[PDB]
Amino acid sequence: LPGFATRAIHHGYDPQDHGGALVPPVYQTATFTFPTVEYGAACFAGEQAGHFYSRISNPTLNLLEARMASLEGGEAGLALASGMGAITSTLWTLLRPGDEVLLGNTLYGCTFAFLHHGIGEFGVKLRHVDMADLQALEAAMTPATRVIYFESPANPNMHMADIAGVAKIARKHGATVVVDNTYCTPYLQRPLELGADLVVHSATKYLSGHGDITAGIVVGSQALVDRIRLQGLKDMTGAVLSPHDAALLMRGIKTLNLRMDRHCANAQVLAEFLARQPQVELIHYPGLASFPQYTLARQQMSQPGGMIAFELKGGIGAGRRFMNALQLFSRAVSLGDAESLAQHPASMTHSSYTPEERAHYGISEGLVRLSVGLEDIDDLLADVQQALKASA
Amino acid sequence: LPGFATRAIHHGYDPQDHGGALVPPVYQTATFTFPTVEYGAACFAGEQAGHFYSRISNPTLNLLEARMASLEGGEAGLALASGMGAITSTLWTLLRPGDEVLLGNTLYGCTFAFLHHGIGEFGVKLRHVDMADLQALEAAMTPATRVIYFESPANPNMHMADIAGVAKIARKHGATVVVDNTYCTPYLQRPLELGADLVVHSATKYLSGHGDITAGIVVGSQALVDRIRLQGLKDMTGAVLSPHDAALLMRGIKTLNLRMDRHCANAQVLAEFLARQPQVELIHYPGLASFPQYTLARQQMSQPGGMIAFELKGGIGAGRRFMNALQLFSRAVSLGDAESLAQHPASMTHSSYTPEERAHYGISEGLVRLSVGLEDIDDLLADVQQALKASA
Amino acid sequence: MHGSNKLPGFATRAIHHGYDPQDHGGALVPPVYQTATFTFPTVEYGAACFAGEQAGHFYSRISNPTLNLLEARMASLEGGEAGLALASGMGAITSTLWTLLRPGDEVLLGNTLYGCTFAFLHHGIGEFGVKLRHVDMADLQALEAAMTPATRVIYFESPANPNMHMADIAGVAKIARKHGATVVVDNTYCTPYLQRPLELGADLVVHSATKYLSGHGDITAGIVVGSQALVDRIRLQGLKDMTGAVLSPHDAALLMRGIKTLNLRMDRHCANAQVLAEFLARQPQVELIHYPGLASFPQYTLARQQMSQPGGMIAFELKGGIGAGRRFMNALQLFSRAVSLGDAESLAQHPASMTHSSYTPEERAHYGISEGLVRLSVGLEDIDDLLADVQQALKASA
Amino acid sequence: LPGFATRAIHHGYDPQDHGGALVPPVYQTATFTFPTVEYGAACFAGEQAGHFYSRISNPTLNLLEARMASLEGGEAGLALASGMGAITSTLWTLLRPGDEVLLGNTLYGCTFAFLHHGIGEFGVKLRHVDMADLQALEAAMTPATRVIYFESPANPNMHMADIAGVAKIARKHGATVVVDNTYCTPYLQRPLELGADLVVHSATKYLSGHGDITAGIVVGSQALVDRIRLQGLKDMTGAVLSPHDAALLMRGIKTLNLRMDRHCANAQVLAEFLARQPQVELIHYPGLASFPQYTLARQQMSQPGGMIAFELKGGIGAGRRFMNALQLFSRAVSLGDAESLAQHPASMTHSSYTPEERAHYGISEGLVRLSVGLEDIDDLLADVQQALKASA
Ligand SMILES: C/C=C(/N=C/c1c(COP(=O)(O)O)cnc(C)c1O)C(=O)O
Ligand SMILES: C/C=C(/N=C/c1c(COP(=O)(O)O)cnc(C)c1O)C(=O)O
Ligand SMILES: C/C=C(/N=C/c1c(COP(=O)(O)O)cnc(C)c1O)C(=O)O
Ligand SMILES: C/C=C(/N=C/c1c(COP(=O)(O)O)cnc(C)c1O)C(=O)O
Ligand SMILES: [S]
Ligand SMILES: [S]
Ligand SMILES: [S]
Ligand SMILES: [S]
User: Fold this and answer.
1) How far apart, in whole angstroms, are the C-alpha atoms of residue B179 and residue B177?
2) CA spacing 20 to 30 A to D297: which of B133, B222, B315, D253?
3) What residue ranges define each of the domains in chain A, with the CATH number in brackets?
4) Which residues in chain B have their CB less than 8 angstroms from residue D23's CB?
């Protein structure tokens, strides 16, 4: 088994099959032709290796998919136009009216909205469970429980889930476990190795790494991914990834190990700095010894990540003053870019929640979320320092 | 109002607002930053004009959208990752359990599958009607009829509906009319100017014109398009169009009038040829006086289009041999490319239908569909001529 | 049928020549080889590719399959044996002239040249020992009299940028066959759709593919077409070693995309410019108008003989000079004020202070570039809109 | 002054100047329009500071140029279509017949060919000198000497020049010192800070880092760079860089520090390994204590680089066997890619030399050059080990 970095660069491609091209050619084409109509018929009937239409399948996409499958340790991958494309295609495929889906307590805003205002209004029942409490989950299981879906760590408060414990219970009741692995990437956490059936990503974030594409990935078993490809994507979402963006995403993945090492090292220093400060009420960072689920985080994640959540004394008032004073960090939603970013979840990425939904799903009105970038740590420390002083 | 060609090249863009750039800069960026967090919050609340995240809205995509809205004569546009993206995003936002959707008798294969095996399995009721029979449409209207959805001409047999006559019935009962205008483009037919509320396109086809991107477009009122953007696209499909692909689509749109004029002139010559050949049993082309809905075609489309459907005397056997013999035409699904294409709908684009459904909804075995390209007509005729000899 | 030895039509070749989807997994559009390098199955195979015995690929500055397709397609459209794609029109011109000329050689030049070409010749290669001579290439007797034993290359544009002076390409070629000179024609203005100098006896043609070939103003690119021997030499000396003007595969793909509508775009550019030129010739403010489609065009019969249609470019002059030209160009609302040509968007510019600013004031009067000259590149917009814009701007120039 | 990594990500760009775009919009446009013709005439005269034509200058290219200038510590940068673009545009601007150029003893093959068979045949005089030998260099200066040009380390034997020493000598005659810094990049070595006037790069290599573009960079003083832009590029080469490629190059530059750290760390391990092997006669790697110019290397380079050259005892025959047995390394020219590469300079990168010129200018038959990539070192080690086994 070649190492992670080796596979991120090489897996599924030999230059000698494409005229010696070191970088795979980009198949920017909507359709593919057939040598005979019988050959083509066979492609549609599903009984043939090949290609017919890029919404169903495309060789640039297929390479990205195989490579992502290798990094997560799954059988099959699927590339989509966005993270939301990956989540919707998956959930539209696996659920029908009268199925239940058990969710983690805190979700990304558009995932929450899709669940409650989207698929939830088509007869699919939803219940929220703390996915670190295996007893509370087991109690929540019903015979209608088809899917278990959660993020770990969760956007935006960093709440962990016990992936292996959830999976044991799901295996017992015949439930499909789907884990949003956006924050960690396969370099830091591999939920499939801990018993998840499917992983989904916003490849828009760390996997791309450079903020220039929107994309989604699904990885899991051949049987589940085939269904998601041929139903969710083909017929229910049409969330097709551009071959151009797929080739940029592959370009990004080639440095994923190096970039994540630096995001993690920078974020550790900033977290430890923010811990020592009087303006800071509390911090959620997995790599601080004081993190409430430090032990569980270490059994699942090989490093503590690039994301920090924290609150100031002064609440939202001091939050605004801090964020508005940042000169190197930018004020923006998104994460996992080379550029360091800051945002206010309640009024931005989680503004789809009502104030009461925000309150009891653990999205504070004072919370600031930092995506720590690849800039020099001293420049980033200086920027945070002066913004804290301006926030007082 | 400037002419169609002028608007396809210029509408919505002034080089002076982007440093004099004659071609608009490509905004290949997932996120946008804010000068203050209150500016950001204001954007997320709708109260400020600006950008935050490309899945929701992006300036390259917005120029495409505004240009397409102008060409169709509608108020607002939306760009998506595929035609299926446009259709699913639209219908997921407009429909809920208990609603009825009235459908044209014949639909594109994945549209049919989406309706019967996707949204129709989430409690939405479907009924098919002959949209050319206005009395039968009226007779099928119920108070639960929320949406009337059809293609005109229909993929693949070219069956037409009287859009203004359908719209009248919709206005009487309070239904929303959604027209798939893929085949005509806004250059040949503008269903919004005949009372339709929304038009959808596979921009993958004629609008791109060159076979290199997958894309979809929705045009209609600001009110409907805003909902499709903020619910269907944002939450239920994630079918986000790449700025790179949007830029290519705008490039293609600049020659739309010229290309369609050639597609049409070529197809007319080819159709007249085919109509005189001894191997041909039947042909559906709207520009032939023998076309059953010739008067309606001349009234509603400014040219008869680039698409031909016909049947050979020897059924499926002769169809196969014909298609296998083509040397200049390629055997492929898709349409509206520079390259001339041929396919067998029953085994390909409409293979999601069962044999019973195909017979019921008008997709015979025997049917061949041509997308007539931009090649020299003498070359296309010689290719068709020899393939017809080969068909015996 | 009338037999499979018939050449497919121009439009067919612009779409299909050199490419079969079945050789690339069925891809209808050719995959883009956006790769700098190519690998070898063995070291010997690799040594053979640098030698030039093994057919294949090693490094995109020398050669690349996306570029090769573009090159073969342009060769087909021009009726030449081989093609070469470069980073710009100037790339094509410089790579060609650096390959063909050495100190002591003389190049005979058309009386009027694109500004950067003029500058390259007089201030570039001309300063490294190459002798230059300008001649009216419409005057075959003067060309014959200017030929010397040192004359290695004859180089000109037809029609010339920006005054549209023409040369008799077949007449020039005949003189060049008799004396032994290589004839190089810049065919940017016509494209192979309207004029094919290699079929009239030229050895090499060069293009700014940035213009009509692309058609959409989004790339910079150059093309050279000619004999296998001359194009190979240009590839391996000019491009590889003396300019490094390598075309991006991304841009070559976009250029190919544009070439697929070349016939349709040129037809419309030409029909639009014809209506505009006839309109302008009837207007009070116009001193003179040069459009090959008007019988008043000084070399009208030569234009009709070499060009299948009269082009998309108009050069004209208002009564009022510089003065009135400024006020016309400034009142345009649909036309843009800009250099370049052959875009979907209609453009207007002023050679003497823009594309020919590199010429001294004296050199502009000597090589036929007036102070009142206004050049129009007529685009693809609706002709009624372009007429309305030019009509209102004429009024405002009074 | 912000750190290297900060500047490689941010220098010269503020999102707030471009509608908040986190990533700069790509100006894929050939031409730029004017609000008036006076304004237009002023751009061509250099009196107004706008844009007119992308061969001269373009905002995407200018951003790249300013960022590279910041990384090298120079006043001004220029982006070109290739490394050869950069070298030729530079030398054509600076040299005229009767001028002399003093050259490093070993040069990249196409540079050598350009010099001997290109500009050298237009009356420019060439002399090769050992650029570590300051008394020989002093002695070789003549009144005709106008440019001193070399690579350090030299492609392909790793010979170093004393850049500060060369610059001291040049200064006594007003000569212009041009350094090809391709191998090191500005992260490892900054010749302008050691007294060079101009640096050139094949940005195709480490700067891009991903093998997908061809590009060149010149950095230097404003007056020299202005002339290279307006004479060498504009008029003498036309080596214009695509804005698309310039955007990809900027993307690559954002991880330059992280990639170079890994290239160097990997190469250090492989060099240490190869230096102890019985099949190996000689090795050139700056990081080895036995490297002849170890002390000088450490004065100029912050890390010893990702390139290794070595010779096997079995000569050219053993060389061939080694290369053919490699399974993870590819056989290819080029360097500075994520993928590890190996080549034979005598029959590839330096095949433009004759046998006697190779022997004379230090390029052996038997030399193998490795460009060590970003793959897992344990995988690279295994591949080199088995290939060494197969060579003997
Ligand atoms: C502005 C958007 C942010 N997130 C997105 C996201 C998505 C959805 O991913 P697309 O945006 O559709 O690619 C899915 N899963 C997770 C854990 C996510 O964070 C953000 O928080 O900053
Ligand atoms: C291979 C695809 C074909 N059609 C597609 C299509 C779509 C769906 O559009 P995307 O493919 O998702 O962009 C929507 N609406 C119509 C009238 C269509 O023809 C085809 O028939 O050849
Ligand atoms: C702004 C540029 C214009 N022309 C360019 C051009 C070139 C040089 O071509 P690149 O620009 O290097 O692609 C070569 N040959 C001809 C007959 C040309 O017109 C223009 O005049 O409008
Ligand atoms: C195949 C090419 C290789 N080298 C190139 C190169 C160039 C020329 O750079 P473009 O190739 O024109 O970008 C300039 N300067 C140096 C030190 C170089 O190594 C190679 O060695 O493997
Ligand atoms: S968002
Ligand atoms: S399809
Ligand atoms: S120019
Ligand atoms: S090379």
Assistant:
1) 7
2) D253
3) 2-256 (3.40.640.10), 257-390 (3.90.1150.10)
4) 28-30
